[PDB]
Amino acid sequence: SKVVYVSHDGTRRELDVADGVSLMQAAVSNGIYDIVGDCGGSASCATCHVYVNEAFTDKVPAANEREIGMLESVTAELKPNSRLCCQIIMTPELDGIVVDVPDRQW
Ligand code: FES
Numbered sequence: 001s002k003v004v005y006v007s008h009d010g011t012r013r014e015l016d017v018a019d020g021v022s023l024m025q026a027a028v029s030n031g032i033y034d035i036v037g038d039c040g041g042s043a044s045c046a047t048c049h050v051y052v053n054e055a056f057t058d059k060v061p062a063a064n065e066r067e068i069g070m071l072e073s074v075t076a077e078l079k080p081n082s083r084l085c086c087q088i089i090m091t092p093e094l095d096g097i098v099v100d101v102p103d104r105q106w
Contacts, residue, residue, distance in 0.1 A: 025086070048086045061087075
């Protein structure tokens with residue numbers, strides 16, 4: 001399924017992500033350098049921060065308590081649509097999802 005990672009300067013990078021793969025994993029294994037994913041996807045670091053386009057924030061599972069706590073420590077601006085993309089699992093239902101990546105993770 002399609003996922004578009006828009007870098008902070010506007011570059012739209014599209015990837016085909018298989019079902020069950022997190023957006024963080026697909027990102028770090030396909031050159032999306034603006035996403036670090038340091039902890040490996042256990043909602044333990046804040047380095048996979050992205051802004052989910054509002055047309056999809058409702059189709060994606062709500063952030064659990066751990067993510068909510070971790071998001072408080074994001075280094076870039078924290079927005080209402082901020083999410084740790086390691087917590088977003090790709091599914092056909094999300095095909096076309098767009099996420100904007102901040103200018104910093106650390
Ligand atoms: S990869 Fe660490 S919180 Fe997402």
